[PDB]
């Protein structure tokens, strides 16, 4: 129960129930919105449109199809059915689809940067950064070295996304220059001069 | 945000609090509902209230003792937890209609709970900001500023960046998942990261004030502490870095 699509392509997720209903819904669930209620077809309906979604039902054998045209970055959640009895009593969640979306960077510019030391601090700290959503980063493979996944940043100011990963160590041996090697680093990264 | 106002997004407890969660809505719906989800899971249905009729699907309703003194509030008191009762608590309403047609829900923020069974293993997070690399603002014009929040325990924090005193959204990027400090141990220590990316020019202004704050919940006040270390409370920790002139 895992999709994963490139910005503007279509989703399609599925879902079934088990007992008798008066109406299926589908629900998104993210850290963004919260879990939000998309649309709700009658057990006596086959198919609702509402802006990009469409879902289907089909109740000879119980299952439900929900349709994201152009999806967009946003529709990155998980997404759940719910049915309901009349009455309120019986609103009852299935499994879920985790849907993820990855955007197109436009411009990419693959780079590793060390950061200033904290004066406060020991870790030193390594930015691998503007990479395109190609790139997966590895986690650590060192007890005392720590590598975040990637996190995809709008400066909303320049109309401009990015890519970026973090690793810090406060070893002495650590060094940001290999820092990411465990990754498939593209061969246009830029380690620039200090 | 919604309608569904939910309190508290996070809390930390031991085996002997008690503790309400407390959900209200005023849009004149007529039934309330709180479920439950484990880390990967669907929303597990605990209760419903509605009409004055509670309709239980929890196994240990005691444990929740659910309240309603009208019916735009559905409460659920706490006690005597297990940390098994770890989960996010989600409280919803559906107006239903006359007939009880209208049975879509409206969910509140949720309630991210930790039941833990030792308070000693209670951290707050270390805070530290870490300057933009000097390279970076020459092949780029940007400056990405990292800050991170290490050693915190459990796993409820809320970070936020600051410029001279307002909260910045715009060129923010906080890890979307925590890291195991020590990934192979049920109890490890978190870390999280986040970025503030802003053009050079900002950044190369040493009267610009960048802070970033985070946000821990912990222990309350009527949780006893007997430790030598400081109370682990629920408090905000912060780490400020000042901009550079070229
Ligand atoms: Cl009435
Ligand atoms: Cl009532
Ligand atoms: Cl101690
Ligand atoms: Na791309």
């Known amino acids: 129960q895992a999709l994963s699509i490139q910005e503007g392509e279509n989703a399609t997720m599925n879902c079934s129930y088990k007992?008798?209903?008066?109406?299926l819904q589908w629900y998104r669930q993210n850290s963004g919105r919260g879990l939000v209620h998309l649309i709700l077809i009658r057990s006596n309906e086959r198919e609702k449109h509402s802006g990009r979604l469409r879902v289907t039902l089909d109740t000879s054998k119980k299952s439900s199809s929900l349709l994201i045209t152009a999806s967009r970055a946003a529709d990155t959640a998980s997404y759940f059915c719910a049915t309901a009895a009349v009455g309120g009593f019986k609103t009852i969640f299935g499994a879920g689809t985790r849907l993820f979306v990855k955007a197109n960077i436009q411009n990419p510019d693959p780079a590793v940067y060390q950061l200033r030391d904290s004066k406060s601090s020991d870790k030193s700290v390594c930015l691998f950064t503007d990479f395109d959503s190609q790139t997966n980063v590895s986690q650590s493979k060192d007890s005392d070295v720590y590598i975040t996944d990637k996190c995809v940043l709008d400066m909303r100011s320049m109309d401009f996304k990015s890519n970026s990963a973090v690793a810090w160590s406060n070893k002495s041996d650590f060094a940001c220059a290999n820092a990411f090697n465990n990754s498939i680093i593209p061969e246009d990264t830029f380690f620039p001069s200090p | 945000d919604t309608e569904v106002t939910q309190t508290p997004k996070h809390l930390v407890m031991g085996m002997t609090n008690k503790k309400s969660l407390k959900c209200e809505q005023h849009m004149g719906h007529r039934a309330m509902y709180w479920y439950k989800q484990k880390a990967k899971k669907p929303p597990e249905l605990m209760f419903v209230?509605?009409?004055?009729?509670?309709?239980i699907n929890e196994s240990v309703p005691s444990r929740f003792s659910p309240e309603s003194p009208n019916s735009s509030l559905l409460n659920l008191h706490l006690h005597a937890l297990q940390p098994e009762d770890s989960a996010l608590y989600l409280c919803?309403?559906?107006?239903?209609?006359?007939?009880?047609?209208?049975?879509?829900?409206?969910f509140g923020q949720g309630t991210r709970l930790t039941v833990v069974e030792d308070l000693n293993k209670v951290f707050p997070p270390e805070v530290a900001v870490f300057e933009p690399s000097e390279a970076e603002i020459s092949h780029t014009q940007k400056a990405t500023l990292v800050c991170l929040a290490t050693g915190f325990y459990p796993d409820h924090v809320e970070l936020s960046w600051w410029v001279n005193g307002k909260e910045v959204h715009s060129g923010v990027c906080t890890d979307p998942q925590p890291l195991k400090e020590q990934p192979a141990l049920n109890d490890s220590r978190y870390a999280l990261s986040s970025r503030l990316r802003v053009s050079a020019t900002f950044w190369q202004n040493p009267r610009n004030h960048f802070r970033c704050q985070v946000q821990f919940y912990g222990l309350s006040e009527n949780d006893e502490w007997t430790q030598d270390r400081a109370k682990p409370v629920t408090q905000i920790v912060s780490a400020e870095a000042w901009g550079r002139a070229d």
């Open positions: 209230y509605s009409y004055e009729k509670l309709s």
């Open positions: 919803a309403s559906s107006p239903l209609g006359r007939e009880g047609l209208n049975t879509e829900a409206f």
């Open positions: 007992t008798s209903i008066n109406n």
